[PDB]
Amino acid sequence: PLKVEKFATANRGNGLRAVTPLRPGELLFRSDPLAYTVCKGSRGVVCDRCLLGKEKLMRCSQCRVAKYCSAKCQKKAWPDHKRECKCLKSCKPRYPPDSVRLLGRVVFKLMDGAPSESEKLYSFYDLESNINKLTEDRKEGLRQLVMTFQHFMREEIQDASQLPPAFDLFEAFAKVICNSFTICNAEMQEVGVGLYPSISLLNHSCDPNCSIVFNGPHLLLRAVRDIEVGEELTICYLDMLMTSEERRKQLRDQYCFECDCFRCQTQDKDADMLTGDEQVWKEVQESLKKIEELKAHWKWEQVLAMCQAIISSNSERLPDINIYQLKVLDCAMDACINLGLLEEALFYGTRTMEPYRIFFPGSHPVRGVQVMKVGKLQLHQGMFPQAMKNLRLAFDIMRVTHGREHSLIEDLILLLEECDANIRAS
Ligand SMILES: O=C(Nc1ccccc1)OC[C@H](CN1CCCCC1)OC(=O)Nc1ccccc1
Ligand SMILES: C[S@@+](CC[C@H](N)C(=O)[O-])C[C@H]1O[C@@H](n2cnc3c(N)ncnc32)[C@H](O)[C@@H]1O
Ligand SMILES: [Zn+2]
Ligand SMILES: [Zn+2]
Ligand SMILES: [Zn+2]
């Protein structure tokens, strides 16, 4: 018996609503992807199957593009990699955009695979394409993706008989644009992209009542507020550290809608997000383009050097609640963690704590993980009472956002048991 059901909304297409009253932390749906792939920057850094980094990955001998953490993942990935391997090999120096590799896997799954549990509530066939709202600029880009797909896939797909019935590649890429999910690892680093068609029933809110979290490629959907029978379920499609004008642009460009929520009507939090000298934060926003590019490719030493030049600039500095300053602090913390610079990581991480409390209200998995990183940093440096407070705070958030079905709770319970034994050892 499901706790959620598809319905037709008044003005935003299909959606999902509660069948029964829901409480914070309640598991609503869980799903493997219909199709997924590793992202550009993480290719060769994380396992194509389980999306975990190992220090040394094994490559597929035939294409030498797919890489794996273990014989177990390489062998289990083979049915879903079989046909793309052909194409990646044939096009050896060329690597396709992520969306093209993704759609390749969609087609092979729908052609060769049994009906997917991911499509239980709503199928790839059903997905919104927004084709009557696409701008001419967007259509041109989709036509290029179609031609890229035809080129990449030519070893395996030559005619329409190798696509699902009446499959239209232009429409399929239109669906991919507004229905792709960014898969994050346990540390909330972007590592993959996937389609989860039942989860695509959820409409957007800038102040949502549900949240998704990833455990490898597996997706958990949880309530993060009380929800009444019949109430629409929403998730936030967007990074929380964005102004209403930034959200407007992305929701128009990627999802073809105008957001009517209270936060957009009132520019909620915009003023605080943009405090400090605007010439300084325009420069930092510009620099973040390279910093985030370096981060997506796991280039931690280069990330840290660019962030230090901002955080400890000789020139004017920004308040930590400024969102571009805050993003730099977060990138610097993660770089220090992965570089083993744990004292410097704690300094940057502690500074993000109050801004994260403000900008991630209620129960948000990004804040839960950030607090857990800070508590873990405090535990490794012997600050047991403060670590214990932050690890317990992380648990209060992540019991709602992650839940017992997510492996990171088990890891957090271990830090709580450990840190607690130390306080009681006095
Ligand atoms: O601890 C976690 N994850 C994790 C941690 C917190 C929240 C959410 C997730 O996994 C192990 C992974 C191993 N990592 C070591 C660096 C090189 C790459 C592999 O990173 C870490 O030790 N982190 C870490 C260490 C100290 C303080 C805070 C975080
Ligand atoms: C992931 S799908 C959500 C389900 C979609 N309504 C459907 O019928 O399949 C994303 C699309 O839903 C619509 N949508 C999502 N949130 C919306 C919102 N808050 N207001 C208006 N339309 C929204 C837009 O068409 C968007 O491109
Ligand atoms: Zn693996
Ligand atoms: Zn291969
Ligand atoms: Zn909004």
Swiss-Prot record:
The keyword Ion transport does not apply. Signal peptide: none annotated. Its EC number is 2.1.1.354. A zinc finger (MYND-type) spans 47-85. Zn(2+) 1 binds at C47, C50, C69, C73. Residues 2-238 form the SET domain. Histone methyltransferase activity strongly stimulated by HSPCA. One of its GO terms (molecular function) is histone H4 methyltransferase activity. Pfam families: SET, zf-MYND. PROSITE patterns: SAM_MT43_2, SET, ZF_MYND_1, ZF_MYND_2. It is found in: Cytoplasm; Nucleus. It is an enzyme of class 2 (transferase). It comes from the Eukaryota. Keywords: Acetylation, Chromatin regulator, Cytoplasm, Metal-binding, Methyltransferase, Nucleus, Phosphoprotein, S-adenosyl-L-methionine, Transferase, Zinc, Zinc-finger. The keyword Nucleus applies. GO terms for cellular component: cytosol; nucleoplasm; nucleus. CDD domains: SET_SMYD3 (cd19203). PANTHER family: HISTONE-LYSINE N-METHYLTRANSFERASE SMYD (PTHR12197), HISTONE-LYSINE N-METHYLTRANSFERASE SMYD3 (PTHR12197:SF288). Histone methyltransferase. Specifically methylates 'Lys-4' of histone H3, inducing di- and tri-methylation, but not monomethylation. Also methylates 'Lys-5' of histone H4. Plays an important role in transcriptional activation as a member of an RNA polymerase complex. Binds DNA containing 5'-CCCTCC-3' or 5'-GAGGGG-3' sequences. Belongs to the class V-like SAM-binding methyltransferase superfamily. Histone-lysine methyltransferase family. This is Histone-lysine N-methyltransferase SMYD3. It comes from Homo sapiens.
